[PDB]
Design a protein around this ligand. Structure first.
Ligand SMILES: Nc1ncnc2c1ncn2[C@@H]1O[C@H](COP(=O)(O)OP(=O)(O)OC[C@H]2O[C@@H](O[C@@H]3[C@H](O)[C@@H](COP(=O)(O)OP(=O)(O)OP(=O)(O)O)O[C@H]3n3cnc4c(N)ncnc43)[C@H](O)[C@@H]2O)[C@@H](O)[C@H]1O
Lengths: 473, 576, 393
C-alpha cells in the first residue's frame, strides 16, 4: 500500500528538521543574501528564472568553498528557501551535487511551496537516478500547481486534513497536483501546526485513490523485474561469450586473427558460424551491456561503488574482447577516427570505471608467463592500425602531393610506430597480431616498402624475426 | 500449551522473583525436581545506562571466546548487547559467584532449571540462559537440558543479530516474556539516553518497588512517557518503512541525520489483557505492537496513562494469580486477528502493520519452499552427477587431473564442463543473494542437507573456478585470487561447514599457483605450512590424492623442481 | 541388413567425402525414391553406426525441422560404398548409380570419344566439376533417371542442355563449393521437365523474380540456402534460410494458393514482409525465425483461417504481435522463444487448447494472464549447448 509513504512522512514530521528550518526562515524574513544559520551540526541556510541563478552565481562562487567544507565535515547540510528562494536553492544544490562526489554525505534540498519550471528533458535525464533523492517539495492538498513546460522533479509531500504523505512517482505526482495554481498561499506555520496536531491525533484517514497505488506498485514490480532479469541474464551473457572465445580459438588455430576473419566475413559472407556469431551473440551482448550502462548510471547499485566487481570485471573483458569487432564494422564503411569521432559511450564509461577502480589494486606481472591467452589492453589499438593504413595509401596512390601533407603523414606514421613499439615493449598486446595473414603483417610490409633506408627499434625487431619468440616464453 | 509451561511453574517463578527481590544477587529455590534461580533487580538509573561508555544507548560488541554461536555465519559479524547487563552477568558469573557449583550439581542431577526475573534481573536471566546454552546444551547433546527462561516485562537486551542468532539455533522457543498492556519498562531502553537523561533518575526512583514513597511528579512522568513513546513511534515507523522497502534512497538520506536504538525483541512475547492473554512470536510484529497497544485513547486516557504505567509494573501479581481464568489466543494461529486487535485496544494502523509482517513471513517461507523445490529437481543434480562421475574418471585415466585438462581446454568436454560450472555458480550466487537480503527463514542457513549440498558443490567446482581464473591471466589484472577473486558463495559455504562440524583444502591449488616460479627460500615457511595441512586434508577427503599426485599435474612438477633438502626432510617423500 | 537400407546407403554414397551435408538435402534427394519416410531410414542407419548425426540449432527433431541436423560419414565407409557401387556396375548404361568427375575441364574417357548417343539408364547420376573446368556441355541424355546432383565450384556455371532430354527426373540438387556465390544460367531447361517435384539451391546467385517467369508446370517444394539475390501450379512448400541481401520477399509468392508452408529463417537483412500475404488461404505453418531486422509482423494475418502452427522464435527486436490473432480458430500451437522484450495483446483470451512453447523469462508473459485464459498450457524448454556449428563452420 502507498500508506508506507505517509509512514515515513510521520518520521519526517517527528524530527524538528522542517520545524527548525521554517522557524529560521521566518526569523530571517521577519537580494541574494544567503544567511547561514548553522548552529552546531546542521547547515540551515535560507536562499534569498535562470537570470536569478546567473546573478547569484557571483556569491555562489565564494559560498561553494564553505559548502564543500561543510560537506567534508560530515555535518548535515540543508538548503531551502521561499517560492523563488526555494527554486534558487534547488538549483544551487543540484549544481553542487553535479560537482560534488557521491561518496560524501549527499545534501537534501527542501522547497517551501516554491514553484520551479522543470524542463521535461531534465526530468527524463534524472528520472530514476538518485538525484531526486536530494530534492523534496511542500505542496498542500488545497493548493495545486498546473504547469505545461515545467515538470515535477524529485519527491513531493502532499498534506491533507490531518497529516501528510510523501511520494515520488512523477506521473502520480503530476496527476495529484494537476490542479491549477492557486494565488492564495496559506501560512506555512499554520500547515506545520496542523500537521503537528494530526501527528498528535489518534488516527488519520486515507485520501490517495487506488489508481495511484496501482501505478506505483506496477512501476516498482517492473523495475524489480528488470533488475533481477539483468542480474540473471549476466550468466547467459557469459555463456554466449564462451562461444566467442571458442570461435577466436578456432580462428587462431587457422593462423589468422579472428578480427581479420570477421572483417572478411562481413565483406564476403561464406559460412554460417560467422553469421550466427555476428547476428546472434554480439547483437545480444551489445544490447545487454548498453542497457546495463544506461540504467546503472542513473541509480548506482551501491553507494561509493558504481557497480559490484562481478559486473565491472566482466564488462572489462567484454569490452576488451568485443570492441575490435565494432572497430572493424566502423572502418569497413569508410569512416575514420573511431577513437574520437565515432566511439560509443558505454565502452568509454566501462573503461573509465575500470581505470578508476583498479588503481587501488596491487597487481604484479612476471617476465615468464605465456601471453598466448592475453587480451590487448588498448581495445582501440586495431583502430589506430586501420588509420595508419589509410595514410599509407595516401602516400602510394596519391601523386603530386604538397610537402606539408607529406611531412604531416610522415610524422603521423613515425608517432604510430613509436606508440606501437612502446605498447609492445610493455608486453600489453596478444601475439595474435603477429599472425601471418593478419592486417598487421600487411601494414608492416607497406611500412617497409615506404621506409627505404630509415631504421629504428621496431624495424630491427621485425627484421631480426624476434617477434616469433615474443610471447612463447 | 504450546509454550511448554504450566501454572505451578509460573507461580514458582513468581515466588522466586519475589524472594530474590531483595539485594541478594542469586536466589535458589529447589521445588520437586526443578531448581529455579532468581536475580536481584535494580532501580538506579546508573544500572540501566552504563556511565563508562560513550555510546548514545549503551551498546557493546560481544566477544568470540564466550558467545561463538551468537554471530552471523555469512557476514561473520558479532552482535551487540547492553553493557550494564553484560557487566552484571560477568560479575555474578565469576569464580566466587558460587553459581558455577550450583549449576554443575544441577546438571549432574538431571533436573529442570529456569532463570527468571521481574524487572531487570530477568533480562540478566536471558544473558544467563544463552550462556547456559553456549556451554552445555550446544556442546553436550548427551543432556536433555532444555532450559526455560521466564521474564515479566523485561527491557530489550538484544539487537536484530541477537534475535537472528537465537532463531537460527532453534532456541527462541525456550523464552517467554509476559508484559501488561501499560508497562513502559520494556520500551525505556528504546528511548534516547539524552532525551530522558534527566527524568530517568526520578522515573527509576518512583518505579522502585521497595521505595514507593517517592514524590511522583506528574509533569516529569508525563514528559518522560511522551519522549519514550515518541522515540518508539519513530523506530516503529522506520521499521515498517524498511519492511515495505519503498523509498530506500530517501529513507537512508533521512536516517543519515536521525538516530534510532538498535534494540529488538528477543523470543516470544505474551501481552496480558484484563481478561485475555495474547501471544506473539514474530519480532517485528512484537515491536510494532509495543507502540500501538499503549497508544493514547483519549484526553482522559492520555492523562491517566502515567498512573497505569506506574502501577502495572508492580501489579504483576494480579495476572500471575488470575492466569487460571483467562482467554488464550495465538495470533499466528488465526489469521483474522481483528478479534484480539479490537479486544486489546489497537487501531487499524497496528492491525495493517502486523498483517504486513505476517505476509512478509509467509512470503519468505514461500521463497524457501521454492528454493527447496528448485534444488530438488533432477535436472539440477544431473549436472553435478555428470561433473563428478563422467569428467573426472576420464581425465584421471588420461594420466592427468581434470584441473590441468580444464586449464588447457582442447577437448569438447571442456565446453560442457565450463557451461555446467557457470550455470551452477549462477544458481548458487542467486540463492546467496536471495538469502543475503534477509528474505529466507533463519532456520534455512541451519539446515544440514543444504550445508552438505553446498560443501559438495564447493569441493567439486572450486578447482574448476580456480583453473578458469588462472588459465586466462585474470589475476594479473585483478590480483591474487585469495584476495579479490574468490566468489562470496564459496566463503559462506566454507564458513557454514566449519561452523557445523564444531585455510581450506579447496584453495589448495590457489596456493600452488603462487609459490610456483618464485625462489624456494623466500617461501620455505609457507611451503612447510602447506606440507602439513595437505597431509591431514588427505585424511578428511578435502583433496583426493589420486589427483594431485598424478603424473601431468602441475603440483608434482613444482614439488620435483624444489631443492633436494626440502624433499629430503619432507613427509611427502613417499608419494614421489 | 535390409535391402532398402542398403539401397538408401548406396544412393547417399553419391555425395563426395569430407562434406557437411544437411538432412533436408538427402531427404529431398531420396524423397521420390522411398516416399516421405526418409527420416525413419536415416535414424535407422544412424543407429547402426553407419552415419553420424549432429543437431545444429533447435533440438526439436520430431517436429519435422530438417534444417538443424548435420550428417557426417567416415572416409572408410564412403570408400567401401564407392567400391561396392563400382563393383555392382558392369557397363556404362548398365550401372544404375554412376558418378562422373570431369577434372581439369576434361570429359570422361568413356564419353570423351563416344560414337553412339551417350544415354545411361541410371536411377541416380552425379556429376562433379571443379572450378577450373569450364563446365562445358556435351552430347548425352538420361533415359531413366529420377534424381540428379551437381557439385560445382566455378564462379560462373551454365547447366547443360541435355538435361532437357531427361523425362523421368523428379528432383535436382545443385551444390556449390566455392568461396563466392556462383552464377547460374540456362534455367529454362528445367521448366520443360514435367516430372520434377523438388528443387534445391545452395550457395548460388539466382534471380528470385525470374523463378515464376520460368513457367514451372508441376513443382512442389523450393528450398533456398545461401542465395544471392539480384504460373506455379503445384507449389506447396517454400523454405528459404541463410540468404543475405534479401531485403524484402518477392510478390509472386502472394499469388499462389497451393502454398501450404512458408518459413524463412536466419535472414538478417529483412525488416518488413509484404503486407499482401493474407491471400494465402491454405496456409497452415508460417515460421519466421532468426531474423533480427524483423521487428513487426504482417498486421493483416487474421485473413488466414487454416493456421495451425506459428513460430517467431529468434527475433528479439519484435515489438508486438498481431492484435487480432484470436480471430483465427484453427490456431492450436505457438512457440514464442527467445523473445523477451515484447508485449502480447489480450486478444489471446479468445483461444483454447493452445500449447505455448517458451522459456522461463517468456513464461511470465503468459503466467500474468493464466487465470483469465482457459485451455492454454505453457511449456518451457531449456536449450542445449554444443559445438556442431564449429563442425559446420
Ligand atoms: N583472455 C580470454 N581469452 C578468451 N576468452 C576469455 C578470456 N577471458 C575470459 N574469457 C571468456 O569470457 C567469458 C565470460 O566469462 P568472464 O570473463 O566474465 O569470467 P568467468 O565468469 O567465467 O569466471 C571468472 C573467474 O573469477 C571468479 O569469479 C569471480 C566471482 O565470480 C565475482 C565476484 O563477485 P561475487 O563475490 O561472486 O558477488 P558480488 O555480490 O558482486 O560481490 P561484491 O562485489 O563484494 O558485492 O567476480 C568474478 N571475477 C573475479 N575476477 C573476475 C574477472 N577478472 N573477470 C570476470 N569475473 C571475475 C571465479 O574464480 C571465475 O572462475 C568466459 O567464458 C571466458 O572464458
Amino acid at each position: 500500500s502507498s500508506l508506507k509513504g505517509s509512514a515515513l512522512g510521520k518520521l519526517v514530521v517527528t524530527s524538528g528538521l522542517l520545524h527548525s528550518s521554517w522557524s529560521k526562515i521566518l526569523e530571517i524574513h521577519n537580494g541574494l543574501e544567503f544567511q547561514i544559520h548553522r548552529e552546531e551540526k546542521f547547515t540551515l541556510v535560507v536562499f534569498s528564472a535562470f537570470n536569478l541563478f546567473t546573478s547569484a552565481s557571483t556569491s555562489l562562487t565564494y559560498l561553494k568553498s564553505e559548502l564543500l567544507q561543510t560537506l567534508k565535515s560530515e555535518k548535515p547540510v540543508i538548503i531551502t528557501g521561499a517560492a523563488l528562494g526555494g527554486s534558487v536553492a534547488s538549483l544551487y544544490t543540484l549544481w553542487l551535487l553535479e560537482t560534488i562526489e557521491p561518496t560524501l554525505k549527499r545534501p537534501l534540498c527542501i522547497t517551501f511551496g516554491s514553484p520551479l519550471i522543470g524542463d521535461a528533458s531534465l526530468q527524463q535525464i534524472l528520472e530514476n537516478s538518485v538525484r531526486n533523492s536530494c530534492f523534496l517539495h511542500v505542496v498542500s492538498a488545497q493548493t495545486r500547481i498546473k504547469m505545461d513546460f515545467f515538470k515535477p522533479f524529485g519527491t513531493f509531500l502532499i498534506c491533507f486534513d490531518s497529516g501528510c504523505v510523501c511520494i515520488e512517482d512523477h506521473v502520480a505526482v503530476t496527476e495529484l497536483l494537476n490542479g491549477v495554481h492557486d494565488s492564495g498561499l496559506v501560512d506555512y506555520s499554520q500547515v506545520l501546526n496542523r500537521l503537528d496536531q494530526s501527528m498528535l491525533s489518534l488516527a488519520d484517514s486515507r485520501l490517495i485513490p487506488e489508481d495511484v497505488i496501482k501505478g506505483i506498485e506496477k512501476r516498482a514490480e517492473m523495475k524489480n523485474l528488470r533488475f533481477d532479469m539483468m542480474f540473471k541474464k549476466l550468466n547467459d551473457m557469459k555463456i554466449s561469450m564462451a562461444y566467442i572465445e571458442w570461435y577466436k580459438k578456432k580462428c587462431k588455430e587457422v593462423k589468422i586473427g579472428y578480427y581479420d576473419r570477421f572483417k572478411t566475413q562481413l565483406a564476403f559472407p561464406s559460412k554460417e558460424f560467422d553469421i550466427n556469431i555476428k547476428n546472434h551473440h554480439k547483437s545480444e551482448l551489445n544490447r545487454f551491456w548498453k542497457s546495463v550502462v544506461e540504467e546503472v548510471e542513473r541509480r548506482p547499485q551501491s553507494d561509493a561503488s558504481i557497480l559490484k566487481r562481478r559486473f565491472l570485471f566482466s564488462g572489462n573483458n567484454y569490452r576488451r574482447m568485443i570492441e575490435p569487432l565494432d572497430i572493424a564494422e566502423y572502418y569497413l564503411e569508410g569512416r575514420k577516427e573511431y577513437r574520437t569521432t565515432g566511439r560509443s559511450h558505454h565502452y568509454v564509461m566501462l573503461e573509465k570505471w575500470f581505470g578508476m577502480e583498479s588503481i587501488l589494486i596491487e597487481k604484479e606481472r612476471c617476465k615468464k608467463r605465456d601471453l598466448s591467452d592475453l587480451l590487448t589492453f588498448d581495445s582501440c589499438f586495431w583502430a589506430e592500425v586501420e588509420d595508419s593504413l589509410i595514410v599509407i595509401n595516401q602516400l602510394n596512390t596519391t601523386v603530386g602531393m604538397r610537402d606539408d601533407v607529406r611531412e604531416v603523414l610522415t610524422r603521423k606514421l613515425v608517432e604510430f610506430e613509436g606508440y606501437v613499439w612502446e605498447i609492445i615493449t610493455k608486453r600489453e598486446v596478444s601475439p595474435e597480431i603477429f599472425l601471418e595473414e593478419s592486417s598487421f603483417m600487411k601494414w608492416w610490409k607497406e611500412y617497409k616498402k615506404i621506409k627505404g633506408f630509415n631504421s629504428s627499434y621496431l624495424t630491427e625487431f621485425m627484421n631480426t624475426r624476434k617477434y616469433e619468440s615474443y610471447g612463447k616464453s | 500449551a504450546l509454550t511448554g509451561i504450566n501454572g505451578d511453574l509460573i507461580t514458582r517463578s513468581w515466588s522466586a522473583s519475589k524472594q530474590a527481590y531483595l539485594t541478594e544477587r542469586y536466589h535458589k529455590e529447589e521445588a520437586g525436581a526443578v531448581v529455579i534461580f532468581a536475580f536481584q533487580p535494580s532501580f538506579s538509573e546508573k544500572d540501566f545506562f552504563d556511565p563508562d561508555n560513550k555510546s548514545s544507548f549503551g551498546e557493546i560488541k560481544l566477544n568470540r571466546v564466550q558467545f561463538p554461536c551468537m554471530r552471523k555465519i555469512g557476514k561473520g559479524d558479532v552482535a551487540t548487547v547492553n553493557e550494564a547487563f553484560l557487566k552484571n552477568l560477568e560479575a555474578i558469573i565469576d569464580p566466587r559467584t558460587s553459581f558455577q557449583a550450583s549449576v554443575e550439581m544441577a546438571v549432574r542431577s538431571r533436573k529442570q532449571i529456569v532463570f527468571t526475573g521481574h524487572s531487570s534481573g530477568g533480562a540478566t536471566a536471558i544473558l544467563a540462559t544463552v550462556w547456559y546454552l553456549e556451554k552445555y546444551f550446544i556442546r553436550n547433546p548427551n543432556v536433555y537440558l532444555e532450559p526455560r527462561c521466564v521474564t515479566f516485562g523485561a527491557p530489550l537486551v538484544g539487537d536484530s543479530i541477537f534475535s537472528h542468532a537465537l532463531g537460527r539455533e532453534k532456541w527462541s522457543r525456550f523464552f517467554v516474556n509476559f508484559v501488561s498492556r501499560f508497562d513502559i519498562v520494556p520500551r525505556i531502553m528504546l528511548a534516547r539516553k539524552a532525551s530522558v537523561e534527566e527524568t530517568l533518575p526520578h522515573v527509576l526512583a518512583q518505579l522502585d518497588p521497595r521505595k514507593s514513597s517517592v514524590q511522583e511528579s506528574e509533569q516529569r512522568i508525563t514528559e518522560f512517557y511522551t519522549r519514550v513513546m515518541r522515540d518508539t513511534s519513530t523506530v516503529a515507523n522506520q521499521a515498517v518503512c524498511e519492511l515495505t522497502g519503498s523509498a530506500e534512497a530517501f529513507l537512508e538520506t533521512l536516517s543519515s541525520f536521525l538516530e534510532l536504538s538498535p534494540y529488538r525483541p528477543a523470543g516470544t512475547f505474551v501481552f496480558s489483557t484484563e481478561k485475555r492473554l495474547v501471544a506473539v512470536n514474530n519480532s517485528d510484529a512484537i515491536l510494532q505492537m509495543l507502540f500501538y497497544t499503549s497508544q493514547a485513547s483519549d484526553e482522559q486516557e492520555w492523562s491517566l496513562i502515567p498512573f497505569r504505567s506506574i502501577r502495572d509494573h508492580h501489579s504483576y501479581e494480579e495476572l500471575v494469580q488470575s492466569m487460571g481464568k483467562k482467554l488464550f489466543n495465538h495470533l499466528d494461529g488465526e489469521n483474522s486477528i481483528e478479534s484480539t486487535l479490537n479486544d486489546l485496544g489497537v487501531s487499524t494502523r497496528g492491525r495493517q502493520y502486523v498483517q504486513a509482517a505476517l505476509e512478509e513471513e509467509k512470503k519468505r517461507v514461500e521463497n524457501q519452499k521454492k528454493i527447496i523445490q528448485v534444488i530438488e529437481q533432477e535436472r539440477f543434480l544431473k549436472k553435478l552427477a555428470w561433473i563428478e562421475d563422467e569428467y573426472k574418471p576420464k581425465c584421471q585415466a588420461h594420466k592427468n587431473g581434470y584441473y590441468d585438462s580444464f586449464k588447457v581446454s582442447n577437448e569438447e568436454n571442456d565446453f560442457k564442463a565450463n557451461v555446467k560450472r557457470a550455470e551452477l555458480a549462477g544458481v548458487f550466487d542467486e540463492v546467496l543473494g536471495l538469502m543475503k537480503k534477509c528474505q529466507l527463514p533463519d532456520e534455512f542457513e541451519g539446515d544440514i542437507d543444504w550445508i552438505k549440498l553446498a560443501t559438495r558443490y564447493r569441493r567439486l567446482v572450486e578447482p574448476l573456478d580456480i583453473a578458469n581464473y588462472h588459465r586466462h591471466l585474470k589475476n594479473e589484472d585483478t590480483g591474487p585470487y585469495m584476495k579479490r577473486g574468490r566468489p562470496t558463495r564459496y566463503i559462506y559455504a566454507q564458513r557454514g561447514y566449519e561452523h557445523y562440524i564444531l585455510e581450506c583444502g579447496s584453495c589448495f591449488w590457489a596456493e600452488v599457483e603462487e609459490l610456483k616460479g618464485k625462489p624456494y627460500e623466500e617461501v620455505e615457511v609457507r611451503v612447510k605450512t602447506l606440507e602439513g595441512m595437505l597431509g591431514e586434508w588427505i585424511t578428511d577427503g578435502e583433496v583426493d590424492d589420486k589427483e594431485i599426485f598424478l603424473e601431468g599435474s602441475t603440483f608434482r612438477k613444482w614439488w620435483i623442481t624444489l631443492p633436494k633438502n626440502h624433499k629430503s626432510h619432507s613427509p611427502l617423500r613417499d608419494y614421489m | 541388413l535390409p535391402h532398402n537400407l542398403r539401397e538408401c546407403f548406396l544412393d547417399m554414397a553419391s555425395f563426395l567425402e569430407d562434406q557437411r551435408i544437411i538432412a533436408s538435402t538427402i531427404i529431398d534427394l531420396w524423397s521420390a525414391s522411398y516416399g516421405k519416410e526418409g527420416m525413419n531410414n536415416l535414424q535407422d542407419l544412424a543407429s547402426r553406426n553407419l552415419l553420424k548425426l549432429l543437431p545444429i540449432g533447435r533440438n526439436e527433431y520430431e517436429d519435422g525441422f530438417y534444417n538443424e541436423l548435420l550428417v557426417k560419414q567416415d572416409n572408410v565407409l564412403r570408400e567401401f560404398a564407392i567400391n561396392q557401387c563400382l563393383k555392382e556396375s558392369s557397363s556404362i548404361f548398365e550401372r544404375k548409380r554412376l558418378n562422373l568427375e570431369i577434372q581439369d575441364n576434361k570429359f570422361p574417357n568413356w564419353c570423351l570419344n563416344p560414337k553412339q548417343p551417350i544415354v545411361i539408364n541410371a536411377s541416380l547420376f552425379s556429376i562433379s566439376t571443379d572450378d577450373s573446368f569450364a563446365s562445358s556441355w556435351f552430347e548425352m541424355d538420361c533415359p531413366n533417371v529420377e534424381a540428379l546432383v551437381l557439385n560445382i565450384s566455378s564462379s560462373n556455371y551454365a547447366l547443360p542442355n541435355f538435361i532437357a532430354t531427361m523425362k523421368e527426373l523428379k528432383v535436382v540438387i545443385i551444390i556449390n563449393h566455392g568461396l563466392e556465390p556462383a552464377k547460374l544460367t540456362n534455367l529454362s531447361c528445367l521448366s520443360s521437365l514435367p516430372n520434377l517435384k523438388r528443387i534445391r539451391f545452395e550457395k548460388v546467385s539466382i534471380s528470385l523474380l525470374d523463378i515464376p517467369k520460368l513457367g514451372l508446370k508441376s513443382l512442389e517444394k523450393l528450398s533456398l540456402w545461401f542465395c544471392h539475390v539480384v504460373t506455379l501450379q503445384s507449389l506447396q512448400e517454400i523454405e528459404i534460410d541463410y540468404c543475405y541481401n534479401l531485403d524484402e520477399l518477392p510478390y509472386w509468392i502472394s499469388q499462389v494458393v497451393s502454398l501450404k508452408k512458408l518459413s524463412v529463417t536466419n535472414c538478417n537483412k529483412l525488416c518488413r514482409v509484404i503486407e499482401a500475404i493474407g491471400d494465402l488461404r491454405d496456409l497452415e505453418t508460417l515460421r519466421l525465425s532468426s531474423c533480427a531486422s524483423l521487428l513487426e509482423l504482417p498486421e493483416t494475418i487474421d485473413r488466414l483461417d487454416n493456421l495451425r502452427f506459428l513460430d517467431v522464435s529468434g527475433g528479439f527486436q519484435l515489438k508486438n504481435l498481431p492484435l487480432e490473432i484470436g480471430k483465427l480458430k484453427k490456431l492450436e500451437k505457438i512457440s514464442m522463444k527467445d523473445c523477451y522484450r515484447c508485449e502480447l495483446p489480450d486478444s489471446v483470451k479468445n483461444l483454447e487448447n493452445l500449447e505455448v512453447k517458451c522459456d522461463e523469462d517468456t513464461a511470465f508473459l503468459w503466467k500474468i494472464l493464466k487465470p483469465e485464459m482457459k485451455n492454454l498450457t505453457i511449456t518451457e524448454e531449456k536449450t542445449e549447448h554444443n559445438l556442431n556449428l564449429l563442425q559446420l563452420f
